[PDB]
Design a protein around this ligand. Structure first.
Ligand SMILES: O=S(=O)(Nc1cn(C2CCCC2)cn1)c1cc(Br)cc(Cl)c1O
Length: 303
């Protein structure tokens, strides 16, 4: 079992936090918020670095380029913005979605951005030009998450319509649709580190690890509370093999990947833990909570 202990508590956002992400080089934490801001913090001691502003409405998600030099944000103002982190400047505004943009990610090459929206589409954008390359009629309800696999050749998307879909990046074709009988809304999905599985959260207090080639559920992780909010889940790859998620009972849950047992619950937050992120090289977790709690917390474990 890990022994995550609280090291720093960070404050500054003035409305609900929506997303926290560590930069791939491990140097920074980015947070996004309904207060329309992105904030950058030192990954190791939480030292505030800068505020990045320009969206006209709140932000649901942020994501880093592989060289840690760019951010992309997804906003209720129906746009994504590409940011130069060092300058704070908006390089491009990605226009095309017809409603709130809920989720975004760079591909590993970071020449493309994928986005998902309340407008039920997935869009693929050229980073250099800001042009939308493809619009995929991906789902029949808001798109809750979009993620590239480790070589960039596939996209996975999830939706409140109950589906997870696998897309060929280059062609835009749907290669696979994952289905559940009770059809609970899918609130989050991402590829596993080795690219063979997808981890999917559903709004019935359940995380599932799917082999999407076989269309088979291999693991289920339960015990937490998740019936309302889009709460990310993470693979922890630096020490023991853990699954990490926030929860609507104000705790961070950590599970053993293979046995599905809860190995730790992190207490401290005073509201829903809306987002967590795992550091790329150290056993460090960042957690963020909703507008009653107002903090981001940094935790460290020996394994
Ligand atoms: O999910 S994984 O991509 N690979 C994987 C799967 N399993 C078992 C076998 C099938 C079900 C779970 C073991 N390793 C992965 C997860 C974590 Br946390 C860390 C790393 Cl390093 C990693 O590679």
């Amino acid at each position: 079992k890990p022994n995550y202990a609280l090291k720093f508590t960070l404050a500054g956002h003035t409305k609900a936090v929506s997303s926290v992400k560590f930069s791939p080089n491990g140097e920074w934490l980015a947070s996004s918020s309904a207060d329309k801001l992105i904030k950058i913090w030192g990954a190791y001691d939480g030292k505030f670095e800068k505020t990045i502003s320009g969206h006209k409405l709140g932000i649901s998600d942020v994501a880093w380029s592989s060289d840690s030099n760019l951010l992309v944000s997804a906003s209720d103002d129906k746009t994504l913005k590409i940011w130069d982190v060092s300058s704070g400047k908006c390089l491009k505004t990605l226009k095309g979605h017809s409603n709130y943009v809920f989720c975004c990610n760079f591909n590993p090459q970071s020449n493309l951005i994928v986005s998902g929206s309340f407008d039920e589409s997935v869009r693929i954008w050229d980073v250099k030009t800001g042009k939308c390359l493809k619009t995929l009629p991906a789902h029949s309800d808001p798109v809750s998450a979009v993620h590239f696999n480790r070589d960039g050749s596939l996209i996975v998307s999830s939706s409140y319509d109950g589906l997870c879909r696998i897309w060929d990046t280059a062609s835009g074709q749907c290669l696979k649709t994952l289905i559940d009988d009770d059809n609970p809304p899918v609130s989050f999905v991402k590829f596993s580190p080795n690219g063979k599985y997808i981890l999917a959260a559903t709004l019935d207090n359940t995380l599932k690890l799917w082999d999407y080639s076989k269309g088979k559920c291999l693991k289920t992780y339960t015990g937490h509370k998740n019936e309302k909010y889009c709460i990310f889940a993470n693979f922890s790859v630096t020490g023991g093999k853990w699954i990490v998620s926030g929860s609507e009972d104000n705790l961070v849950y950590i599970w053993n990947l293979q046995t599905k047992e809860i190995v730790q619950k992190l207490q401290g937050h005073t509201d829903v833990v809306i987002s967590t992120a795992c550091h790329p090289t150290e056993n460090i977790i960042a957690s963020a909570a909703l507008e009653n709690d107002k903090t981001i917390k940094l935790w460290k474990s020996d394994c």
